[PDB]
Design an enzyme around this catalytic site. Structure first.
Site, PDB file in Angstrom:
ATOM      1  N   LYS D 162       0.851  -1.181   0.000  1.00  0.00           N
ATOM      2  CA  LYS D 162       0.000   0.000   0.000  1.00  0.00           C
ATOM      3  C   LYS D 162       0.886   1.230   0.000  1.00  0.00           C
ATOM      4  CE  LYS D 162      -2.773   1.550   3.545  1.00  0.00           C
ATOM      5  NZ  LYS D 162      -3.794   1.215   4.576  1.00  0.00           N
ATOM      6  N   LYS D 164       0.665   5.627   0.003  1.00  0.00           N
ATOM      7  CA  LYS D 164      -0.238   6.711   0.356  1.00  0.00           C
ATOM      8  C   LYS D 164      -0.102   7.796  -0.702  1.00  0.00           C
ATOM      9  CE  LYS D 164      -0.514   5.972   5.399  1.00  0.00           C
ATOM     10  NZ  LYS D 164      -1.520   4.912   5.098  1.00  0.00           N
ATOM     11  N   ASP D 193      -4.032   4.908  -0.758  1.00  0.00           N
ATOM     12  CA  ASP D 193      -4.676   5.525   0.405  1.00  0.00           C
ATOM     13  C   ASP D 193      -4.573   7.044   0.281  1.00  0.00           C
ATOM     14  OD1 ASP D 193      -5.670   6.274   2.926  1.00  0.00           O
ATOM     15  OD2 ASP D 193      -4.280   5.008   4.049  1.00  0.00           O
ATOM     16  N   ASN D 195      -6.065   9.166   2.487  1.00  0.00           N
ATOM     17  CA  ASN D 195      -6.150   9.745   3.829  1.00  0.00           C
ATOM     18  C   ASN D 195      -7.052  10.985   3.837  1.00  0.00           C
ATOM     19  OD1 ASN D 195      -3.053   8.454   3.886  1.00  0.00           O
ATOM     20  ND2 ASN D 195      -4.167   8.241   5.830  1.00  0.00           N
ATOM     21  N   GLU D 219      -8.592   3.822  -0.665  1.00  0.00           N
ATOM     22  CA  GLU D 219      -8.857   3.928   0.761  1.00  0.00           C
ATOM     23  C   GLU D 219      -9.072   5.386   1.159  1.00  0.00           C
ATOM     24  OE1 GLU D 219      -6.108   1.603   3.020  1.00  0.00           O
ATOM     25  OE2 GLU D 219      -6.260   2.845   4.805  1.00  0.00           O
ATOM     26  N   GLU D 245     -10.735   2.644   9.192  1.00  0.00           N
ATOM     27  CA  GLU D 245      -9.733   2.863  10.232  1.00  0.00           C
ATOM     28  C   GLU D 245     -10.151   3.936  11.221  1.00  0.00           C
ATOM     29  OE1 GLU D 245      -6.927   4.176   7.207  1.00  0.00           O
ATOM     30  OE2 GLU D 245      -6.248   5.698   8.652  1.00  0.00           O
ATOM     31  N   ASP D 268      -9.883  -0.493  12.758  1.00  0.00           N
ATOM     32  CA  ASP D 268      -8.668  -0.313  13.542  1.00  0.00           C
ATOM     33  C   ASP D 268      -8.918  -0.922  14.923  1.00  0.00           C
ATOM     34  OD1 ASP D 268      -7.115   1.340  15.599  1.00  0.00           O
ATOM     35  OD2 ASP D 268      -6.172   2.022  13.732  1.00  0.00           O
ATOM     36  N   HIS D 295      -6.425  -2.388  10.304  1.00  0.00           N
ATOM     37  CA  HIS D 295      -5.613  -1.175  10.232  1.00  0.00           C
ATOM     38  C   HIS D 295      -4.715  -1.144  11.451  1.00  0.00           C
ATOM     39  CE1 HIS D 295      -4.749   3.270  10.637  1.00  0.00           C
ATOM     40  NE2 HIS D 295      -4.374   3.006   9.399  1.00  0.00           N
ATOM     41  N   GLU D 315      -2.791  -5.432   7.614  1.00  0.00           N
ATOM     42  CA  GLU D 315      -1.874  -4.336   7.317  1.00  0.00           C
ATOM     43  C   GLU D 315      -0.599  -4.496   8.139  1.00  0.00           C
ATOM     44  OE1 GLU D 315      -2.822  -0.297   8.553  1.00  0.00           O
ATOM     45  OE2 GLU D 315      -1.708   0.444   6.798  1.00  0.00           O
TER      46      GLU D 315
END
Ligand SMILES: *[B]([O])([O])C1=[C][C]=[C][C]=[C]1
Ligand SMILES: OB(O)c1ccccc1
Ligand SMILES: OB(O)c1ccccc1
Ligand SMILES: OB(O)c1ccccc1
Ligand SMILES: [Mg+2]
Ligand SMILES: [Mg+2]
Ligand SMILES: [Mg+2]
Ligand SMILES: [Mg+2]
Lengths: 357, 357, 357, 357
Positions: D162, D164, D193, D195, D219, D245, D268, D295, D315
């Protein structure tokens, strides 16, 4: 041109003339964090936070003190400050204690901005000051004291009171409401608050019983986050379901109103996000057609409701009176905004020392 | 403590360097009503209204002149003023020309309130001034002029243009977009505006062709009040449908967003209700997750966007440049709020006389 | 080929034997614009508009005079006329005062077309003239006058009356209804009109109390544009919620009916778009299964309802009686269409001069 | 009966071989609270919390220390403990830092319960240990370092990584994905991801470009609490939207899944409520048909996923490796649960000293 120059917090445990008994526990003292926001313009903004339980009090102060470096040297621009905190806490979670801390900063910044412009908060927001009807908020007091405090409230000129219910038996809830009713007469408001204590079928059964007795609204019958269950309860009632004090941010209010959880709303000036979050919440309540009341923070809520298109009631529950000068007054049951800049909060510095943690 | 002491309006027909041709007719000159709100603090609030067609210009001024009796000697509190106007016009219909006149009063009142407090409007609203990306807004210009104007806009630092389309053939729509794109390159915004000229099936067909070509948004593809039809159009597209310039009040925005009419919004400072209405619209766009741009009124929209959580683009279309001093500047395509109290509108008093109707 | 040759408007303030008190203000005199539409065929069409407040009166006249050039030399074809106006005002906003102005032109054009063909409007629309039951429409008159007027209406042969309510207390609302009921008996209609004065929870509480008392319908309990709130109110009632007088165009009626805001409708001949809009509103009410009444404009409304498949009640409130010959008559509470071509409107030319603005 | 006999917390700021850069800021070191739950059985439960920002670190430890009084001398029954904490914080807000603190206690309590019964946590929950496929989780690293870390991960045996994303330009997102893909081949997972860094229209545009390149999931494209916006993004994609998460408690997961926000979920272990909340989350994912990943908290997530009916990916992002013995191993890209009681956490006691705050 006006910068934030510093942040000072003081954690206090302050006494209450009457503990706030609820169906899920008693708040016998108010754990508060008092906030001073220093600025380059020679004014200091004041606000405070309610920690609900002393277990969270020191953690909340520590959080605010560690947040000072985020806001010091930033412009006194509360809307911009709020967006900065929202983004900075987006991984950790901009809710709970963190959001409550940002709301305390927000409320002190708006107080300071009002001071910068030498004008009450309500006027800075573009509205006129107006008296706002207030109900005297009591607690799970038992039939005897509940009737006594109701009579005193009517003697002081309030036109409504809120009692907190959720006794072991429904007949105990009813006996309290009936006793207050006989003491105040029919032309009087009796709000009731279950503080999330019922499951959905129990809420329907007790609420339809209370509805037959005659109550003004039914507040948080079940778990605060269960918007669907609140909708199901409201679907079985004529009397309005009331909620909102536990909405952390206007986004949570938006989720609840979108599914029809309640016909009344009462955001909490702290949990909704301060003045900035309140203003957004009032725009939502207007469009969803929801009469909007306040929860606690009576000092700033008097300014905020005066600017709220669907303003309904102010909650009188004076958690901070022992440390704040009583510049806010009540005439004929109505809160009267003081002719002071900002919010009108003046610390009782000689009293605060008695309560420091 | 600050009262409105007079209202003066001037109706003008002002020249435009380029007529605003649209699919549904050409605005060759701008019919404006300029508004002066005198106050007991000496300062005068300034705003203006866009009547769209000269047919409505004298009617709008006459309406404003007859509304003076409702606001003169009232406090300079724009939010309270707006609530009073909403109630007084609730039988007549608080929409259309009546609502536009109330918005013009609201915008002048906020300009005056910023002047009372010697601070730019953005800072009075609690936000920092920030530059905001602007697109240069053009019209139904034909291939040749559309391309030339796009090149000039790029030379002036703008990063996007808007052209108005809805020619008789779809191939003519495509030819203009293609010619602009050849001249400005791939890293450049091309917004397109149909001005309500298509039915839903035609909008779907033309929009999917424009989507293949490459455009930034598709604005008002069909009748502005048909939110359901805009939703159906948006359901067939990846490119966002953009609308909002014709929402009269945040209540119409709430209806459109509630059914998913568009993925972008662009309220018009006049029709949305002035500053008071824009702040409410801004709260809706945030909760619905809608990037929010402006329509016209670039002078006040630069302030308003800086306070808007989901601010997107400023529309640069300088309807009033001939009568307002160019204190709003553009640096690298970004609108820059001038360091002036209130909105920053200064009349070109010697120019206004040339255009009085 | 009959062409429109000219447009003449006269603004008047006419006296009312009883002012129309409502919960949101009083209409003590009626501001009207009287319309004459001249044609190449030697007939003149007559209609009038209701401006609601004198503040909008001169503005509405000015608007119509500036619209004259749009319609002069156009064929006397009201449906085609309506489409041309919709397009010409699509940027300015085909609603509010502009839409009301177009409706005035529409209503005079259909009157003239009836005259061209020497036939009453109802017959030109393909229907037989029929008597239409009418209710006598009163106002927020207080218990004493409301009862006296209800008795008088019963003596005149009306089988129903409407009173406007929304007094400070619900008990005052109920006292008026009770005192009318005592005086007229059980077999008699009592309609009540809140004129948008209540929020949704107050509307539910008051409406459920009126429903127990016995009323015929509950009209505009909350803000007219809040269709969702009207549905929430209706969802709590057996008695029908009634609305529609403030729909500007059939498209607003379509939005309201699509979400179930009301079980009855009452378009306003002016606001709905004239005859052309009324016929479309009637098609919608038929398909949605909504009994359809009128609001004001009793002269043309008698014709229109006779062509309306779900025609319910005619509102008798004679705003323009001081300037229009009483060719419309009432037999046994039923409006009786006059045997006159077009609408049956004849100006009282000797009276009109007394009220000119 | 086993009782809790003590609670110890240590706040640390531990080093990371690679900072976790994201589109909303960089986590350069990991602020953790390490938790020791002493029991009357002698065994000590171990767990830790991730504070995300050092700004929250001391506040979280203070909160846990003040919560000690609520759990010391209570039975070691995690599910009953969680119910008690939910009730005690129901007024303050059982979310945010308070909920994360309760989860740290829950995860320590379950580790202690596994230790009482001398059995690995997975077996205590009634499941066989099984290897769980893991993706090596990187950050916003730039093309060169992203590709190097992906190559290293592939050499270590992982079958997916993964990265980001959310660089200024979409072209930069694409360059990173393309560079990785060339280096790792087609038979390899590339998760991406954002975020929460995009608005809904930008998420749709970037995600459709990414889906054409070929990615494994997308994500948190937008604000984590905007479940409706995630639904709108997912509506325009074949590739699955992944989130979870930031769900605080299974009740937030229930709201997101109920409206179709995502086709994948990744709770998470901390934010979802520890083991107790995870098991409830896993029942939800099963019924909603959602493949469920983890997560962070790889040590306990290996146990929890082995018990999760729709278990998807683990993860691997080793925030605590500097202070926890490496008993969790990876064979062929699969996490292998250690043959140790409870969770298998053993403190590196001589390393913790170096990082204390
Ligand atoms: B209507 O019936 O609602 C009405 C309102 C005001 C004046 C006359 C009639
Ligand atoms: O009104 B309330 O729900 C409330 C709860 C706790 C303390 C004080 C007030
Ligand atoms: O951008 B617009 O839709 C527009 C319409 C008319 C005149 C000016 C601008
Ligand atoms: O994978 B996650 O989104 C993540 C975010 C921050 C730090 C570590 C991991
Ligand atoms: Mg409460
Ligand atoms: Mg446009
Ligand atoms: Mg009415
Ligand atoms: Mg992530």
């Amino acid at each position: 041109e006006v910068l934030i120059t510093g942040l000072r917090t003081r954690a206090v445990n302050v006494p209450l003339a009457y503990p706030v008994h609820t169906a899920v526990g008693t708040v016998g003292t108010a754990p508060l964090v008092l906030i001073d926001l220093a600025t380059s313009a020679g004014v200091v903004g004041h606000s405070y936070l309610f920690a609900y339980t002393p277990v969270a009090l020191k953690s909340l102060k520590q959080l605010l003190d560690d947040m000072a470096a985020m806001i010091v040297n930033e412009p006194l621009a509360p809307v911009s400050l709020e967006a900065m905190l929202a983004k900075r806490f987006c991984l950790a979670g901009y809710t709970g204690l963190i959001r409550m801390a940002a709301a305390g900063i927000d409320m002190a910044a708006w107080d300071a901005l009002g001071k910068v412009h030498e004008t009450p908060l309500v006027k800075l927001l573009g509205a006129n000051a107006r008296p706002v009807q207030a109900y005297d908020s009591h607690s799970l007091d038992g039939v005897k004291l509940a009737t006594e405090r109701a009579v005193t409230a009517a003697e002081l000129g309030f036109r409504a009171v809120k009692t907190k219910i959720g006794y072991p038996a429904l007949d105990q809830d009813l006996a309290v409401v009936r006793s207050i009713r006989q003491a105040v007469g029919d032309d009087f408001g009796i709000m009731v608050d279950y503080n999330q204590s019922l499951d959905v079928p129990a809420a329907i059964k007790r609420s339809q019983a209370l509805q037959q007795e005659g109550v003004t609204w039914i507040e948080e019958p079940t778990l605060q986050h269960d918007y669907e269950g609140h909708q199901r309860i409201q679907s079985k009632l004529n009397v309005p379901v009331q909620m909102g004090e536990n909405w952390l941010g206007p986004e949570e209010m938006f989720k609840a109103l979108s599914i029809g959880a309640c016909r009344l709303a009462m955001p909490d000036a702290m949990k909704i996000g301060g003045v900035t979050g309140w203003i957004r919440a009032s725009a939502l309540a207007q469009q969803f057609g929801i009469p909007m009341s306040s929860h606690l923070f009576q000092e700033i809520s008097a300014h905020l409701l005066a600017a709220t298109p669907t303003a309904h009631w102010l909650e009188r529950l004076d958690l901070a009176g022992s440390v704040i000068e009583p510049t806010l007054t009540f005439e004929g049951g109505n809160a009267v905004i003081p002719d002071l800049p900002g919010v009108g909060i003046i610390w009782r510095e000689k009293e605060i020392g008695k309560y420091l943690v």
